[PDB]
Amino acid sequence: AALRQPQVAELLAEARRAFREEFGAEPELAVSAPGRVNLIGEHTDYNQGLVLPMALELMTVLVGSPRKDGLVSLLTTSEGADEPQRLQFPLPTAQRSLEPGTPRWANYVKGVIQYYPAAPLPGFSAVVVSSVPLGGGLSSSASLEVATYTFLQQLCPDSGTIAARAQVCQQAEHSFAGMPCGIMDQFISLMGQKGHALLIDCRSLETSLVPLSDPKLAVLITNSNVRHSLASSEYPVRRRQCEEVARALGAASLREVQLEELEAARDLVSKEGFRRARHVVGEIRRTAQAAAALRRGDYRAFGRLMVESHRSLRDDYEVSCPELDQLVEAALAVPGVYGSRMTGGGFGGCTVTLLEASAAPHAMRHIQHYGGTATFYLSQAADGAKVLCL
Ligand SMILES: O=C1CCCC2=C1C1(CCCCC1)N=C(Nc1nc3ccccc3o1)N2
Ligand SMILES: O=C(Nc1cccc(Cl)c1)C(F)(F)F
Ligand SMILES: OC[C@H]1O[C@@H](O)[C@H](O)[C@@H](O)[C@H]1O
């Protein structure tokens, strides 16, 4: 009864309704980009490391039509969007470029338009909707960016690569949302495939599509329903930090650095710095293993590596919060659970629990033993960016 069933036919319906009511015509176009859960490989992406996200059935739909007047008209119905629900603005030019500001939800769309690599980009009308809980750790921002991107490609096809559209979305996040993220979230919103995880090499940008066939094993995403103050603020600090180590170690990134190399170099770098690279360099290894373990389909070693990932993110990288520790520590003591850990950037958001679908009704009865409000998603590994024509 705390479990938010996804309703994706309802999400598109809602979207179509609101559009015809707002603008006076049936929309021509529907796109979706999903939210994500990162199964293992946390704070590795910007250290050119490995990440094992899968796409969620939680998503962000644009529905909309091209305009002859060169201007953009956005209406959002997302519950937690900041006022106003509606912004219009001329397309950028050589002369004027878009500026981030108010409302913030509109900055991600603006961002993508501002860096969209193709021309001529005509003006549009769009309703924006989302079942991705906003600031809940499941990449609402990447779903909206990649949803925008996808809608723009129908207006003006790009002659480019997935990485290029990921980078464009990532630039919008940096410039327009002030969030210096890596490419896991964008990549996965773009490239996810139903019943697969997506093993992303963030040095080479080689990708692997890893079957999650087995219908026994499932994944419980548990929303902590907190986004602590230090989240916004401590992400860039971590990055700056990782940068200095590589700087001091004559290493083009932490990817190339391996743990035997860091152990020796305790004193080349800071004490703070050393306890954090231990996570990155280590993390990178356990994402490889989890990868190789998933192919072998040892649901068990999922745990060792996934529970170890939390410990490392909590004790070493310091991007957990009591609420996460108590959802993780609560899950990892339940028979019928391979393992649990904070997912995405931390200081709040969701845990992810690899468990036997048989014990789903027991875990959701047990957790909601949590000192806070728990929201539950039972996540099929899902499709990436989708167009449907109306
Ligand atoms: O303030 C923060 C902290 C960082 C994470 C986060 C936010 C806010 C920014 C905008 C207003 C609500 C809160 N928004 C997202 N929004 C994401 N917002 C959407 C709105 C409509 C459709 C799809 C969307 O995806 N993420
Ligand atoms: O993770 C899953 N299954 C899984 C199966 C075998 C080994 C491991 Cl580590 C995982 C998922 F996504 F299907 F639920
Ligand atoms: O694993 C940490 C991740 O945090 C996400 O929220 C961020 O957007 C990703 O780029 C990655 O840094």
Author numbering: 2 to 369, 371 to 392
Sentences from the paper on this structure:
Inhibition of human GALK1 (hGALK1) to prevent Gal-1-P production therefore could provide a therapeutic benefit for GALT deficiency. Here, we determined crystal structures of hGALK1 bound with reported ATP-competitive inhibitors of the spiro-benzoxazole series, to reveal their binding mode in the active site.
To bias hits toward allosteric binding, we soaked compounds into hGALK1 co-crystals with galactose and T2 occupying the active site. Additionally, this crystal system is biased for the detection of fragments binding to nonorthosteric sites of hGALK1 outside of the ATP and galactose pockets. hGALK1 crystals were each soaked with an individual fragment from the DSi-Poised library at a millimolar concentration. Several fragments occupy a hotspot distal from the active site ATP/galactose pockets, on the opposite face of the protein. The pocket is lined on one side by strands β8– β10 (Leu218–Thr223, Tyr339–Met343 and Gly350–Ala358) and on the other side by the loop preceding β6 (Gly193–Gly196) and strands β6 and β7 (His197–Asp202 and Thr208–Val211). Fragments binding in this hotspot pocket can be classified into upper (fragments 3–6, green sticks in Figure 2C–D) and lower (fragments 7–10, blue sticks in Figure 2C,D) clusters, according to whether they extend above or below the β7−β8 loop.
